Amino acid sequence: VPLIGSLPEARLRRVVGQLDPQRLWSTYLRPLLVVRTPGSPGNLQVRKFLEATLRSLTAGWHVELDPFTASTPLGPVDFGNVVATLDPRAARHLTLACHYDSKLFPPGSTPFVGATDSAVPCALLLELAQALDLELSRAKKQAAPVTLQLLFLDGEEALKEWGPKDSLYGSRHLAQLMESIPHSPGPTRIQAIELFMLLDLLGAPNPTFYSHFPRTVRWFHRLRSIEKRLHRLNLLQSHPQEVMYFQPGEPFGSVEDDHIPFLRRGVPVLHLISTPFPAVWHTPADTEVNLHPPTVHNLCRILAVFLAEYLGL
Numbered sequence: 093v094p095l096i097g098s099l100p101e102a103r104l105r106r107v108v109g110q111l112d113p114q115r116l117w118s119t120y121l122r123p124l125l126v127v128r129t130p131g132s133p134g135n136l137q138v139r140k141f142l143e144a145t146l147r148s149l150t151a152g153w154h155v156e157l158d159p160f161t162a163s164t165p166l167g168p169v170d171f172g173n174v175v176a177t178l179d180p181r182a183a184r185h186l187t188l189a190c191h192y193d194s195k196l197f198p199p200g201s202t203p204f205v206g207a208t209d210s211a212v213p214c215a216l217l218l219e220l221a222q223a224l225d226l227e228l229s230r231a232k233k234q235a236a237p238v239t240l241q242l243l244f245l246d247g248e249e250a251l252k253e254w255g256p257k258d259s260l261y262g263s264r265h266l267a268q269l270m271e272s273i274p275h276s277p278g279p280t281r282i283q284a285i286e287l288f289m290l291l292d293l294l295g296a297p298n299p300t301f302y303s304h305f306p307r308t309v310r311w312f313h314r315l316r317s318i319e320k321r322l323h324r325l326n327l328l329q330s331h332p333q334e335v336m337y338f339q340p341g342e343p344f345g346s347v348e349d350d351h352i353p354f355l356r357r358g359v360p361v362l363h364l365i366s367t368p369f370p371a372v373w374h375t376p377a378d379t380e381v382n383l384h385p386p387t388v389h390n391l392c393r394i395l396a397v398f399l400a401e402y403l404g405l
């Protein structure tokens with residue numbers, strides 16, 4: 093628990109104190125819980141909600157929009173991703189990512205908003221960024237060498253049948269775009285991704301995560317470690333055992349997600365996705381009241397230390 097690279101408890105406690113669960117849940121989560129398929133009005137409001145929420149933050153992220161067209165198993169659809177980079181002159185960054193679109197389902201069925209998939213994750217990032225705003229604003233001003241980059245991806249889903257030409261429209265393009273952009277050192281923006289941490293299927297009760305890439309397993313250990321740790325310093329609601337979320341040790345793997353286009357380009361990936369998937373997954377039942385708010389908040393706290401331990405805040 094008093095290991096190496098770790099937060100002096102004092103700070104960690106303030107780090108956690110600063111998180112506002114009412115804000116996570118209602119400023120940030122509640123608004124997104126809406127049908128938001130590609131290029132639908134649903135979509136575009138979320139897109140603009142994020143596009144703003146990020147800009148208002150005091151530390152003044154560079155918020156830029158990656159938009160495009162693509163050929164689907166339906167018409168052409170247009171998409172826009174949301175790239176938010178706290179200090180883009182900085183030479184590397186930690187890229188956290190998630191997708192704001194929602195899976196189009198056939199009509200005449202209870203709309204599908206997908207709370208775990210991926211409403212909850214998006215809001216976790218919004219909270220991270222806001223509950224850590226002064227501290228990022230410090231290090232940004234300190235021309236810190238590794239900054240923070242947040243991706244809110246569009247078009248992960250699939251209209252019709254899931255497959256390599258219908259899925260991950262957004263990541264596939266963002267990746268395409270990044271490697272075409274000279275950065276320094278680099279050579280591309282793609283190499284500026286120190287870690288690509290990807291959040292998915294989050295907020296159902298009683299998840300289990302495993303390391304899925306052994307190249308990043310040590311970071312996964314940070315998380316198991318940060319879980320302990322918060323349990324010990326009593327800062328976890330409904331957490332009987334010491335190890336609940338972050339399991340040992342190193343299983344099989346692969347589960348096509350937004351990381352893939354980056355991983356094709358050699359990007360170290362940490363796939364923070366519950367496995368087994370939420371019971372309610374891809375049903376009209378992915379909805380605000382199946383979430384397990386304690387779990388939702390433990391994962392805010394657990395990430396919110398990690399962020400800090402990572403960027404030394």
Ligand SMILES: O=C1Nc2cccc(OC3CCNCC3)c2/C1=C/c1ccc2[nH]cnc2c1
Pocket residue numbers: 209249250254292293347348349
């Ligand atoms: O988006 C998706 N549509 C499908 C239709 C049929 C099967 C599917 O996935 C495989 C079988 C079940 N276990 C492993 C993957 C998917 C799928 C996969 C997937 C992966 C990650 C996701 N994050 C949010 N939605 C996701 C779906």
Ligand SMILES: [Zn+2]
Pocket residue numbers: 195209249374
């Ligand atoms: Zn999905």
